[PDB]
Amino acid sequence: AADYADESAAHAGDSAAYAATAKRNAQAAQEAAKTATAAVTKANEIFKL
């Protein structure tokens, strides 16, 4: 049971350790989305001007 508890903790540890960094990819995607949006916004303002 102790060995299985450690295995469980190991799986949880791996999930959390990866998720804790993988969530930064979502943030990176948000930054990229904002970047693309900004590029479009600038393009629209330039066109109008």
Binding site: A1, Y4, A5, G13, S15, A16, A19, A20
Partner: protein, 49 residues
Amino acid sequence: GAAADAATAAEKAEASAAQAKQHAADADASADAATRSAADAAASAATAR
């Protein structure tokens, strides 16, 4: 979310293992008492003889 659930499962698993260790400890206490009882029973058999 999955990581959080995994962490929860790990905490429960560790708690369960802790209980299992106590159960084994209690089982040992019973086995040790049983051993002493058998030892006394043997002494009683020697006495009866």
